[PDB]
Design an enzyme around this catalytic site. Structure first.
Site, mmCIF file in Angstrom:
data_model
loop_
_atom_site.group_PDB
_atom_site.id
_atom_site.type_symbol
_atom_site.label_atom_id
_atom_site.label_comp_id
_atom_site.label_asym_id
_atom_site.label_seq_id
_atom_site.Cartn_x
_atom_site.Cartn_y
_atom_site.Cartn_z
ATOM 1 N N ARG A 16 -86.212 -37.581 38.391
ATOM 2 C CA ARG A 16 -85.270 -37.004 37.420
ATOM 3 C C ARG A 16 -84.514 -35.845 37.710
ATOM 4 O O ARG A 16 -84.776 -34.872 38.684
ATOM 5 C CB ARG A 16 -86.439 -36.800 36.183
ATOM 6 C CG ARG A 16 -85.896 -37.230 34.881
ATOM 7 C CD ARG A 16 -86.899 -36.956 33.782
ATOM 8 N NE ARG A 16 -86.949 -35.356 33.415
ATOM 9 C CZ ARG A 16 -87.796 -35.098 32.590
ATOM 10 N NH1 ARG A 16 -88.673 -35.837 31.866
ATOM 11 N NH2 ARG A 16 -87.938 -33.723 32.479
ATOM 12 N N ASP A 17 -83.439 -35.999 37.016
ATOM 13 C CA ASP A 17 -82.537 -34.742 37.088
ATOM 14 C C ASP A 17 -82.156 -34.510 38.495
ATOM 15 O O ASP A 17 -82.253 -33.173 39.144
ATOM 16 C CB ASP A 17 -83.171 -33.542 36.375
ATOM 17 C CG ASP A 17 -83.756 -33.906 35.131
ATOM 18 O OD1 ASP A 17 -82.840 -34.113 34.080
ATOM 19 O OD2 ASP A 17 -84.759 -33.957 34.827
ATOM 20 N N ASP A 33 -85.646 -24.573 25.775
ATOM 21 C CA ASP A 33 -85.445 -25.468 26.728
ATOM 22 C C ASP A 33 -86.116 -25.479 28.231
ATOM 23 O O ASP A 33 -85.783 -26.156 29.040
ATOM 24 C CB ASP A 33 -83.790 -25.372 27.160
ATOM 25 C CG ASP A 33 -82.993 -25.555 25.938
ATOM 26 O OD1 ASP A 33 -83.000 -26.789 25.339
ATOM 27 O OD2 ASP A 33 -81.762 -24.975 25.626
HETATM 28 C C1 LIG Z 1 -67.615 -31.600 36.343
HETATM 29 O O1 LIG Z 1 -69.061 -31.973 36.835
HETATM 30 C C2 LIG Z 1 -69.224 -30.786 37.377
HETATM 31 O O2 LIG Z 1 -69.351 -29.627 36.613
HETATM 32 C C3 LIG Z 1 -70.048 -29.791 35.199
HETATM 33 C C4 LIG Z 1 -69.924 -28.527 34.417
HETATM 34 O O3 LIG Z 1 -68.635 -28.268 33.873
HETATM 35 C C5 LIG Z 1 -71.384 -30.185 35.474
HETATM 36 S S1 LIG Z 1 -72.115 -30.713 33.954
HETATM 37 C C6 LIG Z 1 -73.852 -30.398 34.004
HETATM 38 O O4 LIG Z 1 -74.653 -31.011 34.814
HETATM 39 C C7 LIG Z 1 -76.150 -30.616 34.908
HETATM 40 C C8 LIG Z 1 -76.599 -31.968 35.697
HETATM 41 O O5 LIG Z 1 -75.994 -31.870 36.837
HETATM 42 C C9 LIG Z 1 -76.568 -30.414 33.587
HETATM 43 S S2 LIG Z 1 -78.074 -29.731 33.906
HETATM 44 C C10 LIG Z 1 -79.426 -30.381 32.723
HETATM 45 O O6 LIG Z 1 -78.876 -30.331 31.529
HETATM 46 C C11 LIG Z 1 -79.695 -30.982 30.546
HETATM 47 C C12 LIG Z 1 -79.099 -30.681 29.052
HETATM 48 O O7 LIG Z 1 -79.435 -29.418 28.571
HETATM 49 C C13 LIG Z 1 -81.213 -30.805 30.503
HETATM 50 S S3 LIG Z 1 -82.067 -31.859 29.452
HETATM 51 C C14 LIG Z 1 -83.518 -30.593 29.026
HETATM 52 O O8 LIG Z 1 -84.724 -31.503 29.189
HETATM 53 C C15 LIG Z 1 -85.769 -30.968 28.693
HETATM 54 C C16 LIG Z 1 -86.959 -32.011 29.121
HETATM 55 O O9 LIG Z 1 -87.000 -32.822 27.941
HETATM 56 C C17 LIG Z 1 -85.843 -30.340 27.340
HETATM 57 S S4 LIG Z 1 -87.408 -29.485 26.886
HETATM 58 C C18 LIG Z 1 -88.223 -30.756 26.094
HETATM 59 O O10 LIG Z 1 -87.673 -30.865 24.794
HETATM 60 C C19 LIG Z 1 -88.159 -31.709 23.647
HETATM 61 C C20 LIG Z 1 -87.376 -31.600 22.413
HETATM 62 O O11 LIG Z 1 -87.369 -30.076 22.043
HETATM 63 C C21 LIG Z 1 -89.642 -31.249 23.665
HETATM 64 O O12 LIG Z 1 -90.182 -32.471 22.873
HETATM 65 C C22 LIG Z 1 -90.166 -31.357 24.919
HETATM 66 O O13 LIG Z 1 -91.903 -31.261 24.924
HETATM 67 C C23 LIG Z 1 -89.624 -30.666 26.040
HETATM 68 O O14 LIG Z 1 -90.101 -31.023 27.215
HETATM 69 C C24 LIG Z 1 -84.690 -29.405 27.253
HETATM 70 O O15 LIG Z 1 -84.443 -28.982 25.852
HETATM 71 C C25 LIG Z 1 -83.206 -29.918 27.802
HETATM 72 O O16 LIG Z 1 -82.257 -28.910 27.517
HETATM 73 C C26 LIG Z 1 -81.661 -30.789 32.016
HETATM 74 O O17 LIG Z 1 -83.017 -30.533 32.138
HETATM 75 C C27 LIG Z 1 -80.882 -30.139 32.973
HETATM 76 O O18 LIG Z 1 -81.156 -30.682 34.447
HETATM 77 C C28 LIG Z 1 -75.991 -29.811 32.457
HETATM 78 O O19 LIG Z 1 -76.229 -29.824 31.190
HETATM 79 C C29 LIG Z 1 -74.292 -30.146 32.535
HETATM 80 O O20 LIG Z 1 -73.664 -29.405 31.631
HETATM 81 C C30 LIG Z 1 -71.567 -31.424 36.482
HETATM 82 O O21 LIG Z 1 -73.003 -31.560 37.055
HETATM 83 C C31 LIG Z 1 -70.623 -31.219 37.784
HETATM 84 O O22 LIG Z 1 -70.972 -32.297 38.781
#
Ligand SMILES: CO[C@H]1O[C@H](CO)[C@@H](S[C@@H]2O[C@H](CO)[C@@H](S[C@@H]3O[C@H](CO)[C@@H](S[C@@H]4O[C@H](CO)[C@@H](S[C@@H]5O[C@H](CO)[C@@H](O)[C@H](O)[C@H]5O)[C@H](O)[C@H]4O)[C@H](O)[C@H]3O)[C@H](O)[C@H]2O)[C@H](O)[C@H]1O
Ligand SMILES: *[C@@H]1O[C@H](CO)[C@@H](O)[C@H](O)[C@H]1NC(C)=O
Ligand SMILES: [Mg+2]
Length: 360
Positions: free
Chosen positions: A89-90, A315
């Site tokens: 993942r991720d 997060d």
């Molecule tokens: C042009 O592209 C190039 O530039 C770009 C920037 O302009 C980037 S975009 C960029 O990419 C990356 C990946 O490469 C991501 S990183 C990424 O982002 C996610 C969004 O936040 C998160 S999801 C995360 O997951 C968690 C697990 O589920 C939870 S905690 C979870 O919460 C729930 C509900 O509250 C709860 O029930 C659970 O118990 C908890 O576990 C969390 O809240 C989330 O944020 C992810 O982890 C992460 O990897 C960027 O977002 C993005 O902007 C291009 O990559 C690049 O090529």
């Protein structure tokens, strides 16, 4: 055939009780307290981001909705669930909380997870169920294939997505595949490759009835529509979700996938945000609750604005000694100190409440 039309969205009691028991007793402003009670009733998604949630949270939520519906809810309540447990993942992230690995039986583990979710959804065919499929997955195939783990995961992400789409294609379900956000796939150079990718997956899955479209801005902070580009978006001409979606949909449709969209706005109310860079995702400063969930979007490509990430749930920890620490959660524009992922982060909730737009 909008799955958000003709239903109420269930506001779950876990979020409600986080707000009422952990947040509200700490608010010294009478106005902030009243607004918090209102936010407790805003329906957000629930996340199946660990396998243990399937036989716990999913069943509990669907049972509670069934009970409310049988008691006479009008209109009937629908469920909102995120499926988020691909192996490796991720793939482009420096750190991930995913529990499975392709090299360690992850394909089989994931297929079993999907199969069990299917069994449960079939048993709750009286509960309309809206799914977001796998945040932070296929969008990596468009831009992040230079990262060796992403090149290695790509074929598996594709195959397991197709698997999920076919297995979870049930009459009472609507699925939206994650499609990043304007600052990921919305850059003009990425729109066509993204369209090719997602339309081909749709085709290769047999265009399942339940696949409604795509989900954007999941757990991110972008505006739906802002009049001035935030500085961290420059020079992307598609600087909000409306710009992205309006450029993306025609390309998708021309390739056989007339995708409808849902757009996370749960942390999008304050624009510009306090992000210093667009890719800064963790507990971002300078954010507020955004437009409440609704099917009445005014936009023919958008089925709904939704709250996919429930604002106030952390997060990721800022504790750098923690095994699960992600460096994004220790940046200057991440609110600190932050508890473990998913745990209540009251100072973040209060930030979102204070910055809410429209106001509560
Ligand atoms: C042009 O592209 C190039 O530039 C770009 C920037 O302009 C980037 S975009 C960029 O990419 C990356 C990946 O490469 C991501 S990183 C990424 O982002 C996610 C969004 O936040 C998160 S999801 C995360 O997951 C968690 C697990 O589920 C939870 S905690 C979870 O919460 C729930 C509900 O509250 C709860 O029930 C659970 O118990 C908890 O576990 C969390 O809240 C989330 O944020 C992810 O982890 C992460 O990897 C960027 O977002 C993005 O902007 C291009 O990559 C690049 O090529
Ligand atoms: C995932 O949870 C199910 C129960 O829902 C359990 O049977 C299974 O063993 C778990 N998978 C893994 C790989 O532990
Ligand atoms: Mg227009």
């Amino acid at each position: 055939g909008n799955p958000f039309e003709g239903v109420q969205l269930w506001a779950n009691n876990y979020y409600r009780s986080e707000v009422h028991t952990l947040a509200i007793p700490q608010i010294t402003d009478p106005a902030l307290r009243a607004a918090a009670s209102a936010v407790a009733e805003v329906p957000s998604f629930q996340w199946l981001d660990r396998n243990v949630t399937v036989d716990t949270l999913l069943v509990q939520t669907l049972s509670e909705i069934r009970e409310a519906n049988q008691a006479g809810a009008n209109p009937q309540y629908a469920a909102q669930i995120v499926v988020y447990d691909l192996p490796d993942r991720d793939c482009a992230a420096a750190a991930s909380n995913g529990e499975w690995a392709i090299a360690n039986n992850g394909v089989n583990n994931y297929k079993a997870y999907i199969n069990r979710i299917r069994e449960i959804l079939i048993s709750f065919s009286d509960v309309r169920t809206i799914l977001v499929i796998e945040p932070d997955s296929l969008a990596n195939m468009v831009t992040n294939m230079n990262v060796p783990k992403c090149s290695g995961a790509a074929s598996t992400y594709r195959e397991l997505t197709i698997y999920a789409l076919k297995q979870l294609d049930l009459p009472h379900v609507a699925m939206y595949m994650d499609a990043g956000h304007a600052g990921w796939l919305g850059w003009p150079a990425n729109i066509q490759p993204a369209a090719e990718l997602f339309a081909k997956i749709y085709e290769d899955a047999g265009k399942p009835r339940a696949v409604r479209g795509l989900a954007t801005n999941v757990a991110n902070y972008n505006a739906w529509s802002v009049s001035s580009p935030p500085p961290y978006t420059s020079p992307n001409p598609n600087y909000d979700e409306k710009h992205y979606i309006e450029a993306f949909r025609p390309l998708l449709e021309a390739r056989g996938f007339p995708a409808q969209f849902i757009v996370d706005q749960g942390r999008s109310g304050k624009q510009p945000t306090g992000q210093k860079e667009w890719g800064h995702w963790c507990n971002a400063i300078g954010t507020g609750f955004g437009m409440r969930p609704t099917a009445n979007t005014g936009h023919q490509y958008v089925d709904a604005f939704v709250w996919v990430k429930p604002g106030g749930e952390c997060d990721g920890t800022s504790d750098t000694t923690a095994a699960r620490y992600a460096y994004h959660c220790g940046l200057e524009d991440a609110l600190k100190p932050a508890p473990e992922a998913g745990q209540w982060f009251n100072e973040y909730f209060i930030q979102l409440l204070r910055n809410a737009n429209p106001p509560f």
